[PDB]
C-alpha cells in the first residue's frame, strides 16, 4: 500500500537522519514507484539513467559485453536501501560499463523528479540533509574501482566435456581431436572461453593432458 | 589576489560577493608551491582540500611490480583535488597525489562537517551542490574503472584471453598452442610473443610451461 512505500524510503540511504515530517514534504514532490525485475533483466543502461533507483531486495550488478566476451560483472548491489547507478543520473560521458543487470528476483524503487529544479521548493535543512546522504552514497562507490571482475559461469560443463570425449574415445581408451576449439564450443552449446577454462582445471587436477591433437585420459574413475 | 582565484574556482562559482566573504572568514586559504615530483597528499591523512591555480597533479597507486598507475591529470585552473576524501573513505584504492610539473595550489584548511555547520544554510547548500558536481564528473576516470590500454591493442587482447580462462583462485592453465592463440586474437605470432615477453620483463606474469602466474593482479586488471 501507500504506507509500505513510505517506510521503505525512510530506511534507505537517501533518507537517513530526516524526521517523519521532512519525509512527507519530500514525497509531495517526487514520484516513487515499486517495480519488480526477474532474473537476467536489464535494470537500466548507463547511457540512459532517467530515474534514481533504490534497492529493496535482490541483487543487481553492473555489466559489460566484450566484443567476443559474453559478459563481465563489476561490483553488485545487495544491501537494501542502497542507491544503484545514481552517479550516471547526474553525469555520464563514456562509462566503462554499459548497463546494470539483475541476477535474482529483485524489487527496486524508482524516484522521479530528483533534480535541482524540483528540490528548490523544499526546506533548507532538508535539502542540506539530502545532499549529505547523496554525497555519502557517491563517496562509497569510488571504492569499487579496485574490485576484482569476473565473468558469467556456465553451470555444468565438466560433464558436457567428458561426454564429448567419451564419444570421440577410441576402443583402446585414447582420444584424437579432429575439431577446432570454436567447433567444439558450438557443438556443446557453450562459449569458447568457458570451454578452455574447464580444460585448464582438468589439466590442473591431473585428469587429462592435451598433447597436440591427443587428449590422454589420466583418471577415468571420476570421468 | 586569493579572493579572485577562489571566486573563479569550481567550488565557489555561483556564490555572491556577500556569501563569498562569509566563507573566507571561517576557513584558512594558504597558497604554497609544490616542486616537481612531490607528494601533494596521502589518501590516508587527507584533511585539507586543494584548488589548482596552475600546474599538473595526478593521483597515483604503487603496484607490487614497481609501476605507478596514474589517473587523469588535474590540469584545469580552478579544479578541486582531494575532494573525494572529504569523508572517511575507508580503504582508498588510490594512494597519493603527486605533482608532475611546477604547481601552485590553494591549501584550504578547516573544511569539514562541523565547520560548514556554522555557516548559512543557503551557503552550505551551494557548496554541497558544487561539491556533488565536482565529485560526479570525475567518477568516470577515478571511481568507475581504470584502463591503460585500448580494446584493440595487443596487450589487452592477450589480457582478455588470459582472463577468460582464469580460475576462481587466480590460476591459469594453457591448453592451446602459440599458433592457435594468435589466430584467435587476430594477431601475428611474432606480435603475440613480443607482448608476452614485454609482460614478462615488467614482472607482470611468468610463463612456466603451460601455467601462467599473475604476479601483480592490480596492473593486470587495468588491461581488461
Q: Are B202 and B65 in contact (CB under 8 A)?
A: yes
Q: Do domains A2-151 and A158-217 have the same CATH topology?
A: no
Q: Which region, left, alpha or beta, applies to residue A109 given φ > 0 means left and ψ of -120 to 50 means alpha?
A: beta
Q: How far is CA A115 from the centre of its chain?
A: 27
Q: Closest Cα to residue A182, out of A196, A172, A168?
A: A196
Q: Closest Cα to residue B180, out of B161, B199, B159, B197?
A: B161
- Minimum CA–CA partner of B179 in chain A: A212
Question: Domain spanning B2-144: which superfamily?
Answer: Jelly Rolls (2.60.120.10)
Which SS3 state, helix, strand or coil, does residue A32 take?
A: strand
Q: Closest Cα to residue B89, out of B58, B134, B44, B48?
A: B44
Tell how strand B68-70 and strand B49-62 pair up: antiparallel
Cell of B203: 614482472
Q: How far is CA B107 from the centre of its chain?
A: 20
The Cα–Cα gap between B41 and B46 comes to: 6
Please state the domain extents for chain B. 2-144, 154-221
- Give the CATH class of A158-217: mainly alpha
First-last CA distance in chain A? 55
DSSP-assigned states of every residue in chain B: -HHHHHHTSTTTTT--HHHHHHHHTTSEEE--EE-TT-EEEETTS--SEEEEEEEEEEEEEE-TTS-EEE---B-STT-EESGGGGS--SS-S--EEEEEEEEEEEEEES-SHHHHTTS-HHHHHHHHHHHHHHHHTTHIIIII----S-TTSHHHHHHHHHHHTB-TTS-BB--S-HHHHHHHHTS-HHHHHHHHHHHHHTTSEEEETTEEEES-HHHHHTT-
CA distances B93 to A33, A78, B42, B78, B96, Å, are 35, 21, 12, 25, 10
The Cα–Cα gap between A63 and A214 comes to: 37
The residue among A138, A185, A213, A216 with the most chain B CBs within 10 A of its CB, best to mutate, is A138
Q: Are B31 and B104 in contact (CB under 8 A)?
A: yes
Residues 26-85 on A with a CB inside 8 Å of B are 66-67, 69, 72, 74
Specify the experimental method. X-ray
Nearest-Cα distance to chain B for A35, in Å, is: 26
The Cα–Cα gap between A38 and A212 comes to: 44
- Minimum CA–CA partner of B217 in chain A: A148
Strand-pairing partners, residue B8, are: none
What are the φ and ψ backbone dihedral angles of A151, each rounded to 5 degrees? -115, -170
Q: Are A58 and A25 in contact (CB under 8 A)?
A: no
The Cα–Cα gap between B37 and B94 comes to: 17
Task: Note whether B132 contacts A135, CB cutoff 8 Å.
Answer: yes
The domain A2-151: what is its CATH number? 2.60.120.10
Q: Which region, left, alpha or beta, applies to residue B177 given φ > 0 means left and ψ of -120 to 50 means alpha?
A: beta
Q: Closest Cα to residue B132, out of A132, A81, A173?
A: A132
Topology classification of domain B154-221 = Arc Repressor Mutant, subunit A (1.10.10)
Q: Are A216 and A174 in contact (CB under 8 A)?
A: yes
Q: Which residues contact A187 (CB under 8 A, 6 or more apart)?
A: A164, A179
The residue among A91, A120, A181, A198 with the most chain B CBs within 10 A of its CB, best to mutate, is A91
Strand-pairing partners, residue A108, are: A35, A55
- Minimum CA–CA partner of B160 in chain A: A69
**Beta-carbon neighbour count of residue A19 at 10 Å?**
13
Q: Are B164 and A197 in contact (CB under 8 A)?
A: yes
Q: Are A100 and A41 in contact (CB under 8 A)?
A: no
Cell of B182: 594468435
Task: Note whether B128 contacts A125, CB cutoff 8 Å.
Answer: no
Task: Note whether B90 contacts A116, CB cutoff 8 Å.
Answer: no
- Judged by a CB distance cut-off of 8 A, whether residue B139 touches chain A is yes
Q: Are A61 and A76 in contact (CB under 8 A)?
A: yes
Q: What is the DSSP letter of A168?
A: S
Which SS3 state, helix, strand or coil, does residue A213 take?
A: coil
Nearest-Cα distance to chain A for B153, in Å, is: 13
The Cα–Cα gap between B48 and B107 comes to: 6
Contacts of A93 in chain B (CB under 8 A): 140
The residue among B44, B61, B151, B175 with the most chain A CBs within 10 A of its CB, best to mutate, is B175
What are the φ and ψ backbone dihedral angles of B109, each rounded to 5 degrees? -115, 140
Q: Are A170 and A133 in contact (CB under 8 A)?
A: no
Q: How far is CA A18 from the centre of its chain?
A: 31
Amino acid at each position: 500500500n501507500a504506507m509500505n512505500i513510505r517506510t521503505e524510503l525512510q530506511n534507505s540511504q537517501l533518507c537517513e537522519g530526516i524526521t517523519e515530517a521532512q519525509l512527507t514534504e519530500l514525497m509531495n514532490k517526487i514520484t516513487v514507484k515499486e517495480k519488480h525485475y526477474k532474473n537476467n533483466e536489464i535494470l537500466f543502461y548507463t547511457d540512459e539513467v532517467t530515474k534514481v533507483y533504490i534497492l529493496v531486495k535482490g541483487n543487481a550488478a553492473i555489466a559489460k559485453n566484450t566484443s567476443s566476451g559474453k559478459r563481465i560483472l563489476g561490483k553488485n548491489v545487495t544491501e537494501p536501501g542502497e542507491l544503484a547507478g545514481e552517479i550516471y543520473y547526474f553525469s555520464h560521458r563514456n562509462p566503462f560499463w554499459d548497463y546494470a543487470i539483475v541476477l535474482e528476483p529483485t524489487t527496486v524503487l524508482e524516484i522521479s523528479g530528483i533534480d535541482q529544479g524540483t528540490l528548490q521548493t523544499l526546506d533548507l535543512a532538508l535539502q542540506n540533509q539530502l545532499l549529505v546522504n547523496l554525497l555519502k552514497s557517491v563517496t562509497r562507490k569510488f571504492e569499487y574501482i579496485g574490485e576484482k571482475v569476473r565473468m558469467v559461469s556456465e553451470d555444468s560443463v565438466r560433464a558436457k566435456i567428458s561426454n564429448y570425449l567419451f564419444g570421440i574415445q577410441d576402443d583402446d581408451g585414447s582420444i584424437e581431436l579432429t575439431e577446432t576449439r570454436e567447433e567444439i564450443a558450438d557443438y556443446l552449446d557453450i562459449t569458447r572461453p568457458s570451454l578452455s577454462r574447464e580444460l585448464g582445471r582438468m589439466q590442473k587436477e591431473n585428469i587429462i593432458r592435451i598433447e597436440g591433437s591427443s587428449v590422454i585420459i589420466l583418471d577415468a574413475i571420476i570421468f
